[PDB]
């Protein structure tokens, strides 16, 4: 017996990166998982390095970030890499989730990796939210203030919970120091859940773009998918290079280069772009608590896809009507993102409400209807 | 099939904490593994909490620790728990390693868990060394200075490496901020290696005090060893209680309540007690590089126990001469510890050299001789 199979430690690595049997027909949308692993490795390497030069105390935080930019050798690179890779992490995660929804990756027997995936996504959001506060610029402070005040909506105990989160009566030094400790921790938690969702997947294996079994025709993970993953690693590095070296501030807000000032309120307080669709959903509901619930529900509703999809066939490759609906769902999610950063003004207010209704009706009405009708069309159409 | 066996995630937990088949005759020295897990959980919980209130900048570090002691609710407890549990972690680890050496746990087929265990021990040492510097009192600073200057002994590049570690020309702010980031990280690395050494063990299972196979007579981990582990959890908590609540500074050095001062040198610079034997070994060799090598070798030599033990029988339960030698080896290691904190004065200088020779001769001469002779005595004695 080969050592890679005999030794239990080597055999675990072998099972995931070498002998792992994969479908032979995965397309390039199966490359996002390893890109997400790459973003995670870059964030750990850059984040731990920033932590060696950053000071979490509110009197020094913003200046420690300027010290990183100006005095630490290659500090500018490490900071820009960390800030831009946070955006790339979300591009890759939305692509990965888009692939999973289009190809029916959430269907049995893969409900459990999908459900752990939904938690990974929530952990990413919290991680990135706390990391952004650490700069302690204007957007850091004011974004923390408005987002943490959403917790005040929790009935009875909400205000008490907010003061407890802040460690005081507004966002200040206690808040910043705790966000640093939690920002350092959360990526380790996220790496554990990423590993868990792959262990859960390993029972059924990867799905594939046709939606059929691949037990008939498997390929080893290495060398086939190893070398296929390198192509997108270098494509990603080229995109990364263009942002980090040539346009390092394109994805950021200029106001975060002003030190936090509790007196002056910035013109517009908006989240980072990757949170914008959830913010538009929150704005759509007039009630404070209503808005919070809708915003959370917009993520938690992903957990019901395994139920509301009634199709007897996995994925959309062969479903023209499902493909059209999916296209509308995606474009609506991008429009919600754009509406998350407009001013609360006509006619964007009503538009945001219609887009919010469409977002939820995809899960609750349209997908169950369309998937039911397509079942009948496949059966009658092929009689 | 039971869900605990069917579901792959549940089945992994099941395999380690519930159905795991254990020998039915483990004694209380098999309880140190779960005590070490308890110390690790306490250090993670207390350490992450301290990180929410601590400031790593040299101008604020010592004062942030006083703020924790004085102003943070239960800050005194969290700090004393963290500081004392670091000592308990080493008591438990020495007991655990003592059990492993006495019972032959390093012999085939358990070389790999033992070898990963040696790395765990090195990671513990580095973790605790960096954590102690974070207080930035007199012992923090001066202990960092002396220990980091040992690296200057590396030929050719040693001085350059030290300046690179410090981030400057002496121990200062850059050093403290990097030690904070690495102190936060290292426990996560240590938890991974702890898990790895248990996965490696799971192929052969636990050894037992008789040194024979337990494949004939197994007991489930739960409820038997679960409930046996609770006894020592509460015994540990009682010891912890007596230090943390009634004598929280007994194991510490008063000089670490003086703020770091690069000008004034403390009367005596000694490491924390748990590093003292290694320090005595270093002092024994007059050469700087010699001393460093001996000190590292004193830990790395544990890796050769699987080779130098020539016995055909696992462990010392039935070996009167090996038991006597083991007793001398242990007491010598404690004497080395005491000599690590005496002044460099007669007659402790020569004593430290004799004890150092005995430490190494156990591995290189005595154990191979005694184990060879006992093999012959067992065979002839039972003819």
């Amino acid at each position: 017996m080969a050592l890679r199979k005999k030794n239990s430690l080597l055999n675990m690595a072998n099972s995931y990166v070498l002998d792992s049997p994969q479908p032979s027909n995965l397309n390039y949308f199966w490359n996002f998982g390893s890109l997400l692993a790459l973003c995670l490795v870059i964030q750990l390497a850059t984040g731990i390095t920033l932590a060696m030069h950053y000071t979490s105390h509110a009197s020094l935080a913003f200046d420690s970030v300027e010290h990183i930019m100006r005095d630490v050798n290659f500090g500018w690179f490490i900071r820009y890499a960390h800030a831009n890779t946070a955006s790339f992490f979300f591009i890759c995660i939305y692509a990965h989730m888009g692939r999973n929804i289009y190809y029916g990756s959430y269907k049995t027997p893969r409900v459990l990796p999908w459900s752990i995936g939904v938690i990974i996504f929530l952990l990413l959001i919290i991680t990135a939210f706390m990391g952004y506060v650490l700069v302690f610029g204007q957007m850091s402070l004011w974004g923390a203030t408005v987002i943490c005040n959403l917790v005040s909506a929790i009935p009875w105990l909400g205000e008490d919970i907010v003061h407890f989160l802040w460690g005081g009566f507004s966002v200040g030094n206690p808040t910043l120091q705790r966000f640093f400790a939690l920002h350092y921790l959360m990526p380790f938690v996220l790496a554990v859940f990423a590993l868990l969702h792959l262990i859960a997947l390993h029972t059924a294996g990867s799905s594939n773009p046709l939606g059929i079994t691949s037990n008939v025709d498997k390929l080893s993970m290495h060398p086939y998918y190893s070398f296929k993953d390198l192509i997108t690693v270098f494509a990603f590095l080229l995109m990364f290079t263009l942002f980090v070296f040539f346009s390092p501030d394109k994805l950021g807000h200029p106001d975060n280069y002003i030190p936090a000032n509790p007196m002056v309120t910035p013109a517009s307080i908006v989240p980072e772009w990757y949170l914008l669709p959830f913010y538009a959903i929150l704005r759509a509901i007039p009630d404070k608590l209503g808005g919070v619930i809708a915003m959370v529900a917009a993520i938690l509703i992903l957990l019901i896809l395994p139920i509301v999809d009634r199709s007897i066939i996995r994925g959309n490759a062969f479903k023209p009507i499902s493909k059209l609906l999916f296209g509308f769902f995606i474009c609506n999610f991008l429009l919600l993102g754009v509406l998350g950063q407009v001013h609360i003004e006509p006619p964007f207010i009503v538009l945001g409400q219609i887009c919010t209704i469409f977002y939820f009706s995809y899960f609750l009405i349209l997908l169950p209807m369309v998937s039911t009708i397509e079942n009948i069309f496949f059966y009658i159409g092929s009689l | 099939m039971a869900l605990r066996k069917k579901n792959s995630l549940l089945n992994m937990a099941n395999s380690y904490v519930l159905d795991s088949p254990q020998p039915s005759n483990l004694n209380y020295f098999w309880n140190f593994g779960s005590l070490l897990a308890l110390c690790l959980v306490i250090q993670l919980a207390t350490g992450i909490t301290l990180a929410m209130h601590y400031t790593s900048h040299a101008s604020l570090a010592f004062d942030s620790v006083e703020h924790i002691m004085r102003d943070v609710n239960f800050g005194w407890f969290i700090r004393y728990a963290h500081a004392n549990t670091a000592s308990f972690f080493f008591i438990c680890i020495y007991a655990h390693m003592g059990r492993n050496i006495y019972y032959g746990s390093y012999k085939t087929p358990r070389v790999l868990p033992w070898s990963i265990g040696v790395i765990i021990f090195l990671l513990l040492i580095i973790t605790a060394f960096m954590g102690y510097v974070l207080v930035f009192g007199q012992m923090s600073l001066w202990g960092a200075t002396v220990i980091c200057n040992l690296v200057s002994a590396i030929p050719w590049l040693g001085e350059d490496i030290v300046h690179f570690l410090w981030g400057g020309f002496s121990v200062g702010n850059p050093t403290l901020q990097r030690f904070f980031a690495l102190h936060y990280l290292m426990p996560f690395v240590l938890a991974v290696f702890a898990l790895l050494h248990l996965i490696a063990l799971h192929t052969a299972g636990s050894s037992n005090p008789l040194g024979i196979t337990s494949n004939v007579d197994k007991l489930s981990m739960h409820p038997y060893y679960s409930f046996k582990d609770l006894i020592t959890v509460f015994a540990f908590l009682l010891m912890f209680t007596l230090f943390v609540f009634f004598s929280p500074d007994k194991l510490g050095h008063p000089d670490n309540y003086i703020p770091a001062n690069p000008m004034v040198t403390p009367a005596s610079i000694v490491p924390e007690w748990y590093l003292l034997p290694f320090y005595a070994i270093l002092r024994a060799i007059p050469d700087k590089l010699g001393g460093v090598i001996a000190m590292v070798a004193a830990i790395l030599i544990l890796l050769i126990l699987p080779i130098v033990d020539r016995s055909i029988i696992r462990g010392n339960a039935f070996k009167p001469i090996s038991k006597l030698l083991f007793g001398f080896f242990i007491c010598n290691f404690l004497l080395l510890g005491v000599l690590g904190q005496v002044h460099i004065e007669p007659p402790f200088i020569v004593l430290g050299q004799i004890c150092t020779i005995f430490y190494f001769s156990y591995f290189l001469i005595l154990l191979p001789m005694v184990s060879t002779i006992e093999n012959i005595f067992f065979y002839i004695g039972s003819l």
Partner: protein
Amino acid sequence: YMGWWGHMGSPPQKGIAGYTISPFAARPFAGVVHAAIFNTFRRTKNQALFVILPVSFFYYVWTQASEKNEWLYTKAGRHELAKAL
């Protein structure tokens, strides 16, 4: 070298009958007083030398070293200290 329940890797077992009784049917502390006194005495007596010999030797060595060191740093020990350095 270890399997799992049902195929643990034991040589075939045959001819052994094992018996036991329910924890609810048994007195958990039956014979505790006898054990605590006589069993512990037997167990301790048989291991006593393996502790006493090394502990007593290293304690003696330490005591001699620490006493000499103390004496060398008194007035009376001045001359012997001068030679020792």
